[PDB]
Amino acid sequence: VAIRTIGNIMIVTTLLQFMFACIGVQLFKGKFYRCTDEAKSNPEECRGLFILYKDGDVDSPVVRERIWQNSDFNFDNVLSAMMALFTVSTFEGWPA
Amino acid sequence: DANFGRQISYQHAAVHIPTDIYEGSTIVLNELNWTSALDEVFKKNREEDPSLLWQVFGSATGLARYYPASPWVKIDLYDVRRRPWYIQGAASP
Ligand SMILES: *[C@@H]1O[C@H](CO)[C@@H](O[C@@H]2O[C@H](CO)[C@@H](O[C@@H]3O[C@H](CO)[C@@H](O)[C@H](O)[C@H]3NC(C)=O)[C@H](O)[C@H]2NC(C)=O)[C@H](O)[C@H]1NC(C)=O
Ligand SMILES: *[C@@H]1O[C@H](CO)[C@@H](O)[C@H](O)[C@H]1NC(C)=O
């Protein structure tokens, strides 16, 4: 009974989340990509191997691959935007 | 071979591409095509003076092509553009 009497608010907030997800799709469509090393800034450069300096030490290098990978939570399409906005609305991982 | 600490081949010239440079990029492959004509001059020099040590062309794109071909020697941090012999010929004091 409590669920039935409160269905009006759920529809309104779902519609608001949908609108914000559409706006977020328009704003951050595909812009969340990044390379494995913060030196190459396009997919044509994020290929091959690179030297990684562990913990910022210049005397402790290690070879690692370059991968042009998308973010775990992004705004590519409507479903991804809705998921990201849900995680934000749960007040968790939203600063990142 | 004698007067050489490694196993070498005179049939062609080896190419060293540093780790922080991706082979197969447009810049590198283009440099790997027109430099393939140096191998004939590498053999011609060795014919006249058989007691000739490494002949190397240090490209400004990073890759170094040396003759005779021999396998390269932890991680590899070699870069031909930072070598003392490259720097003196790329500029003045
Ligand atoms: C840069 O790469 C180019 C692409 O491979 C090279 O151009 C090709 O060189 C081939 C080797 O000579 C040519 O094949 C033969 O060339 C001789 C010389 O004129 C002729 O017998 C014919 O043109 C040809 N024979 C065939 C096709 O049966 C290619 O024609 C030529 N062009 C292509 C493949 O488009 C360049 O040589 C290379 N640069 C350097 C410095 O090596
Ligand atoms: C090399 O130098 C010698 C003298 O050291 C000289 O006689 C000779 O002509 C030069 N060239 C060749 C191909 O030996």
Side-chain angles (χ1 to χ4, degrees):
Chain A
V1 168
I3 283 156
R4 188 171 85 234
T5 188
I6 202 164
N8 305 300
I9 303 158
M10 291 146 168
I11 284 170
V12 180
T13 177
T14 307
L15 191 73
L16 284 164
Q17 184 171 10
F18 177 82
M19 291 185 28
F20 272 108
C22 287
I23 293 179
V25 159
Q26 304 289 350
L27 284 196
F28 321 105
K29 182 171 40 183
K31 321 189 155 49
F32 279 20
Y33 275 101
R34 80 174 59 236
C35 186
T36 301
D37 58 330
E38 63 183 1
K40 308 305 187 277
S41 59
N42 56 65
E44 272 205 84
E45 285 165 46
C46 190
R47 288 181 304 197
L49 290 162
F50 83 100
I51 310 280
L52 180 64
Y53 295 97
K54 279 209 262 172
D55 315 307
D57 214 315
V58 74
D59 282 89
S60 80
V62 56
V63 179
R64 296 290 160 78
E65 271 275 330
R66 282 169 181 164
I67 312 156
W68 181 259
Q69 53 188 9
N70 206 324
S71 182
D72 271 353
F73 290 111
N74 45 6
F75 290 77
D76 265 0
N77 49 71
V78 191
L79 298 190
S80 296
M82 286 205 67
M83 205 194 295
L85 287 192
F86 179 82
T87 62
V88 172
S89 76
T90 55
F91 284 165
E92 182 65 26
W94 85 267
Chain B
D1 188 21
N3 63 283
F4 262 104
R6 328 172 62 73
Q7 42 174 18
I8 62 170
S9 165
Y10 298 84
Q11 308 308 116
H12 42 69
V15 174
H16 160 85
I17 306 154
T19 306
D20 63 358
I21 291 174
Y22 166 67
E23 89 271 33
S25 81
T26 296
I27 297 91
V28 160
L29 301 163
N30 272 306
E31 195 85 333
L32 284 177
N33 197 46
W34 74 262
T35 46
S36 303
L38 293 187
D39 306 346
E40 182 45 43
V41 183
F42 283 160
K43 303 170 186 69
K44 192 53 68 147
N45 290 352
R46 190 251 180 180
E47 277 185 357
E48 312 171 2
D49 203 356
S51 80
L52 204 48
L53 273 299
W54 311 107
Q55 322 161 62
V56 62
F57 163 74
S59 182
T61 80
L63 60 87
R65 168 177 293 255
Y66 59 95
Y67 183 84
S70 188
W72 198 256
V73 302
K74 285 182 102 93
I75 69 168
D76 173 71
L77 288 156
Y78 190 92
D79 201 337
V80 73
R81 300 176 283 191
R82 304 196 65 110
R83 290 299 278 151
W85 60 269
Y86 185 99
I87 293 174
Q88 79 171 1
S92 306

